[PDB]
Write a protein that binds this DNA or RNA. Structure first.
Ligand SMILES: [Mg+2]
Ligand code: NA
Ligand SMILES: [Zn+2]
Ligand SMILES: [Zn+2]
Ligand SMILES: [Zn+2]
Ligand SMILES: [Zn+2]
Lengths: 162, 162
DNA sequence: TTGACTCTCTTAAGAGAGTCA
DNA sequence: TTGACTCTCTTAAGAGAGTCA
């Protein structure tokens, strides 16, 4: 809600509740042939999820609190960033999973960045494979690799040059 | 429906028309601080676009040919790949711009791959910067770089470990 | 047969808001 | 007040199909 105190209280309640989610260890590729370990705090698969939480889509949740007798509601991963600018360079800021695990609500696995920056982490080589993200990746992106291209660039005639 | 020979004739007519589009020379980053040059064959901004071509969206076009009294229509960048498999790994193949120039129809700037592979090229460091795509990128992706993350991972208390 | 428009849809990273109990 | 559901929307890489002359 409006006041900084009220916002901090929302952030504190969220952290306390998410802090009680089951902690699931995930071993992950870091790039460079190295492996690391992340501890994700995973929202339950089905209700009840935790005080203040409700599922609005297959892998979407919202956090809600009653402040000043009014309901305030946010996307479940946006809460850590309520005191941050909500846009950058004219682009909406989004909660971005460094662990690539939607159910995870560990704020140490989230950043706040444009949707393009967010998406791009899916292909990052990772913190030991050449990640250049200024806010560093925690793991190699799940889609990094050579790809599975069916056909490359080609022409039948002689009308084109690279 | 259409025979192999008829499909080849469609590809040949498409190439002849696209070959007459304006050819625009672009200097592009290759990765590793190197610069290169791409020659894009750009569909016009407004009608007429070329024989067989029509705009179905702000940056979407289709190619249409009528064969033996039947109208056939394809996405304008899919024509080079009409003799290729249309899916891989259970994913639909899509036309992917190696030059990241949507108006470009140069078939030497296109490949045919899953939408995830396609998207991922936006963040590739490029053919001189570490590209690992088996069908190699022609340039560094436009979104490669440190990003513009507004806020990184953080917590107010001690409820979480990474 | 052709051109120039019209419309809605897919995907996977993300969102906001309403209906009931 | 809190919980458990429902619905549609955004973005930027991509699509198919209808109408009229
Ligand atoms: Mg993400
Ligand atoms: Na692309
Ligand atoms: Zn996590
Ligand atoms: Zn990274
Ligand atoms: Zn091009
Ligand atoms: Zn590449």
């Amino acid at each position: 809600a409006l006041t900084n105190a009220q916002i901090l209280a929302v952030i504190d309640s969220w952290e306390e509740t998410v802090g009680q989610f089951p902690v699931i260890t995930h071993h992950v590729p870091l790039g460079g042939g190295l492996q690391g370990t992340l501890h994700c705090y995973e929202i339950p698969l089905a209700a009840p999820y935790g005080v203040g939480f409700a599922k609005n889509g297959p892998t979407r949740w919202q956090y809600k609190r009653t402040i000043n007798q009014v309901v305030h509601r946010w996307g479940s991963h946006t809460v850590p960033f309520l005191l941050e600018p909500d846009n950058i360079n004219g682009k909406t800021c989004t909660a971005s999973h460094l662990c690539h695990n939607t159910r995870c609500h560990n704020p140490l696995h989230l950043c706040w960045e444009s949707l393009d920056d967010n998406k791009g982490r899916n292909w990052c080589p990772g913190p030991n494979g050449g990640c250049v993200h200024a806010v560093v990746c925690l793991r190699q992106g799940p889609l990094y690799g050579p790809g599975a291209t069916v056909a490359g660039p080609q022409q039948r005639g002689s009308h084109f040059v690279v």
